[PDB]
Amino acid sequence: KKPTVSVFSMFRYSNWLDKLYMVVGTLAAIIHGAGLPLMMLVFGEMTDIFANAGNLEDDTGFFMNLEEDMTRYAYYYSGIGAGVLVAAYIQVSFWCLAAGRQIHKIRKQFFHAIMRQEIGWFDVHDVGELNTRLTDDVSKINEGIGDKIGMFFQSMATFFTGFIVGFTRGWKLTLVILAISPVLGLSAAVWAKILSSFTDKELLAYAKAGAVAEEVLAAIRTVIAFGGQKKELERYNKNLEEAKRIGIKKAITANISIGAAFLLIYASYALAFWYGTTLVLSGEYSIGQVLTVFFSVLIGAFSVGQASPSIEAFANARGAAYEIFKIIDNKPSIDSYSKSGHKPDNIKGNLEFRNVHFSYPSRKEVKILKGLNLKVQSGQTVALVGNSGCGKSTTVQLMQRLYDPTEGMVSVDGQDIRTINVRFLREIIGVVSQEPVLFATTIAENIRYGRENVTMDEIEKAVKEANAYDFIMKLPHKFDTLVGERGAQLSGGQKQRIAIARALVRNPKILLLDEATSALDTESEAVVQVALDKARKGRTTIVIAHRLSTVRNADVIAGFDDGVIVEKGNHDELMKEKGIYFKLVTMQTDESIPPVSFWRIMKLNLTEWPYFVVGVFCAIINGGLQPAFAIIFSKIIGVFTRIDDPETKRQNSNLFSLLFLALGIISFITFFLQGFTFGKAGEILTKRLRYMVFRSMLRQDVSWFDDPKNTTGALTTRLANDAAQVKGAIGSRLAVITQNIANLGTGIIISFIYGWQLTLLLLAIVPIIAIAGVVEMKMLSGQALKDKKELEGSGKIATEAIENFRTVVSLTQEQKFEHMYAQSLQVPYRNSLRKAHIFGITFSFTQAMMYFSYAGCFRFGAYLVAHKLMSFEDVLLVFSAVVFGAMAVGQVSSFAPDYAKAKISAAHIIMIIEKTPLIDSYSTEGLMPNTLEGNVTFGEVVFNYPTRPDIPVLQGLSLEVKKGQTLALVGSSGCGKSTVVQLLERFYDPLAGKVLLDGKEIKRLNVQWLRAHLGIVSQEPILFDCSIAENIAYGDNSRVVSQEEIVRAAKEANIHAFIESLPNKYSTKVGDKGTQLSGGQKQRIAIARALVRQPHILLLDEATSALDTESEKVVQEALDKAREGRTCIVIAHRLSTIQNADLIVVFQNGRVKEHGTH
Ligand SMILES: CC(=O)O[C@H]1C(=O)[C@@]2(C)[C@H]([C@H](OC(=O)c3ccccc3)[C@]3(O)C[C@H](OC(=O)[C@H](O)[C@@H](NC(=O)c4ccccc4)c4ccccc4)C(C)=C1C3(C)C)[C@]1(OC(C)=O)CO[C@@H]1C[C@@H]2O
Ligand SMILES: Nc1ncnc2c1ncn2[C@@H]1O[C@H](COP(=O)(O)OP(=O)(O)OP(=O)(O)O)[C@@H](O)[C@H]1O
User: Ligand 1 in contact with 888 (CB < 6 A)?
Assistant: First the structure.
């Protein structure tokens, strides 16, 4: 379990106004949450007074009273609307502002801490993790401290307010609904579990066939070489039959379970309202109280569930922020920002190392230094020589205060480096690295990085002394030319000379050189060397380099070995001692996817039309019942709004409740029918699409496969996951569209039948709510995209900084980098403030229009009832039939798996299916001559790989072999041997030239007919997850193979001497799940599989390159008989294995260099 930091440390950076924002936003969120159940209370009381005035009606004085007091209730609604408007605006705006400020401070402090850390801490964490953290986990913190906390508080406030308003009216109904609530919770949990697990269970069911699919797409070469498509396709089809069976069972079980859960919650609602009606008949409650309690408690209980995503967001926010807080709190051993320490002056430049012991913290168990003791006087030149990894780089890093030594001390002019502060020490010492890194900025700012207060004239003087004066003038924009990867790629020496200019502009007292000219060509090496030896004068320098010519003129050329100093002398002394230096001297000297339209996708499933017809006819009746639910609800509510004897009221109330239950039962059975039929249609669609796409993939040649855009993983994703969503485009899409259409139509029509004015007003005030919702979603998406695109600018600076941590630390420019990051953060800060304000406004308007809509609609309804245009029951009918219809439309649309993913999947699926290969495998259009002979010839054969068309893989190849003659094709891996094997198998058609079979080109022959006559054994013998008998029978596919042929093939391959050793001989299973076999045995079974077909031409491709000698002898024994009487092609990396070969051809980038005999 990942640790968390909790409240005491999560908020942390919050000064004054931040906590004020937090508290005000929380209070506003509480008000906003508590508003809604109060609006329900007003609804209940207004309904009660409407019924009271109606039964008073059931003369104009109390009608005027109705007008005025309903106007007062409209005022109540408008006041609630204004209050929730201001509360929502305040909550969203203040929480977003507080989160933005807090996260801005967090980002600044986190970058500052990362720049503060010592190199040692940086070396135990990879570079790639830090930037990905700084982006993603900071975004997660933004999610955690954003509006989510406000929404969580609003949800809890709704829960508590609903329960409180329920309990203050009547405890009986609240207790009944609360005791029913566990049933609703359990049913919702079941629905969530079954709905979520559906895809994972689908994957689990498919895994069986997916294993075979993955196996085939990894050995495509052999499959197409042996012509096994017409058998592996059928195996895949059988596994798909099994998958289809299990998927059908899963679909029916899941559908019936979901139907049962929905019927359960529906009956729970029905029972609760029936008990409410029974209480009403007893005279203890009124309609208003029952409506208020029921709706309030239900909405509170539903709202308490809405807080779960907020809780999860908070939890992952803490989990992400724990690492950041740990990193920032980590005080390093050496603090570059520390002002403490000595501040020396007039530094002469002497250096002293005494007993210096040091090891890398990453590899502490390995010791690098063994007590260095080095004396350097100011003024002269001291160089260090030695082998790679002998502490030279470690010595340089320790010199400039990067790693403190384990034991011993280093002093400058007799003063310890520990006493001196890090900043001044690093500023004094100048260092030149082996591989300079240049920032993506103009040369002017690159030089400016050396020091802040350097004048332009000083820059010019430094460049003149750095020999870069001449070359810079040739640049298009002189000293302001943009350089780096985006700028023109400068020469290798240009980077080195501008780096030495950057070092020299600081005018350092002590200079360090780490392989200055190691990675430079000689022409620029001479220039940079003369620059180095001109700049070396007047300063004390330490130089380490592999080339001894540069350090030949050094005053003291000290040797280095095993982290200790043994030999110390000059050129003459070193060359007279005949030590390590003398030996070194003597040895050196997505994309454009065209949409395919709904009609084509529907055509992909035209054959199963009866399933679609019954599904649509079931979806019509399923959808059209939500308005019926509304009608029955309004009728039962209005039952008590008329004056009659109690017994008739009880009778018809029970009748309506029973009708409600019966309609629920009908809904359950229709939902089961529709779900089952659509699921079966979709599964048949998926099975047929998988079969056809696998057929098409097996039909096309390898030119498709070699493309790296679509690898084995991509293809198996297409087969497994991509094709499973096609049923989202047709089927379920038709279901949701039809359901929504019927739900809107029935409600609109019945409302028009009952009352046209009120339904007109609703048809005018509901679309604006929907358009407000969609506008809010569009604004949110645009805001997120703009935020990411703007923050990419600061991310670029962050990446440029972190990846060059060594150089930026060495150049003590961390302050400048932080300052540059400051403004790049500052602009998005203002953008975030503006986005917070606009989001507050739009969310306030979205969440407020409902109350004003209620007020206006019910005012219009009251006016209508005032003059007996309609009845209150009709008002409730035309209100419910529209509002519940809209909510149901939204929810049903949410239920379905949208449409965009299905569309983008169907585009790929159709483009793959319709893709006709250049060389059609299944086509019978091809010449069928008699038995083949073996006169293979090549003329001017030219071919280019799809991956590397520019690289010459085949250019004018011309080789010849005759009947019954052994030829060899030796060469480096992938130099043409694979290409000629593939083209003989007809895997790649050469761009130019003719490959003649029996003196005639291989173009006019049918693919299977020509491929059936060749024998291919590759370097890695790939075997399939089946039996040994099946594997050997795979060798030929034109006819079945009996047991005796297998026996004689094994005897010829000599594997039979080992097959009997197996417990189950021929019946032994082979593969990963079976018994493991060695390389020699696998090669023997592979050559047996080659021989069983008995081709008259066979090719070997580096097969004997991975065989142990004991098994190699038996393999050669079998191959000596195999090659006798047959034409053989030999490819191998061993000269001994090709000694018996007669003819050899050597490939040179596809150009024949030497062909003929061995
Ligand atoms: C008077 C009236 O119509 O009231 C509504 C209703 O009040 C609300 C709250 C309903 C109601 O649903 C819930 O209470 C509910 C709660 C949690 C999870 C799922 C449902 C309703 O029960 C559910 C019912 O919805 C449906 O019938 C859907 O089409 C849904 N139904 C069933 O699955 C079902 C099957 C057999 C028996 C009863 C229902 C459906 C969803 C997807 C695919 C096919 C069908 C409706 C609109 C109502 C009630 C009755 C209160 C909601 O249901 C839907 C999906 O329409 C919840 O979200 C909507 C919003 C509606 O306003
Ligand atoms: N971060 C590190 N972790 C572990 N060992 C390291 C690390 N950095 C350097 N070393 C060690 O230092 C040596 C490599 O040093 P570096 O790459 O700077 O060049 P070098 O060996 O001095 O010479 P050259 O110029 O030929 O590369 C190796 O012995 C290596 O084990």
Answer: yes
Residues 405/369, Cβ–Cβ less than 8 Å: yes
926 marked ligand binding residue: no
- Tell whether ligand 2 has an atom less than 6 A from the beta carbon of residue 814: no
Resolution in A, one decimal?
3.9
- DSSP per residue over 261-319, as a string? HHHHHHHHHHHHHHHHHHHHHTTS--HHHHHHHHHHHHHHHHHHHTTHHHHHHHHHHHH
Q: Which ligand 2 atom is the nearest neighbour of the CA of 394?
A: 12
**Pocket lining: 359 vs ligand 2, CB cutoff 6 Å:** no
Q: Is 390 annotated as a binding residue?
A: yes
DSSP 8-state secondary structure symbol assigned to residue 718: I
How far apart CA 216 and CA 210 sit, in angstroms, is 10
Three-class DSSP category at 1151: strand
Which of the listed residues 183, 195, 266 should we mutate to test ligand 1's pocket, taking the one with most ligand atoms within 8 A of CB?
266
Indicate whether residue 265 lines ligand 1 (CB < 6 A): yes
Specify the DSSP class assigned to residue 1066: G
Distance CA 27, CA 900 (A): 40
Please state, as a whole number, how many other Cβ atoms lie within 10 Å of the Cβ of residue 711.
13
Technique behind the model: cryo-EM
For residues 159 and 166, give the distance between their C-alpha atoms in angstroms, rounded to a whole number: 11
Q: Establish how many alpha carbons lie within 13 A of residue 277's alpha carbon, considering only the half-sphere containing its beta carbon.
A: 25
Give the domains, in start order, of the chain with CATH numbers.
1-170+285-339+756-869 (1.20.1560.10), 351-588 (3.40.50.300), 937-1157 (3.40.50.300)
Contacts of 517 (CB under 8 A, 6+ apart): 496, 525, 528, 529, 532, 545, 547, 550
Q: How many CA atoms lie within 13 A of 610 on its CB side?
A: 0
CA angle 79, 85, 90 (to 5 degrees): 130
Ligand nearest 124 Cα, by number?
A: 2
Locate the ligand 2 atom nearest the alpha carbon of residue 388 and give its number. Answer: 21
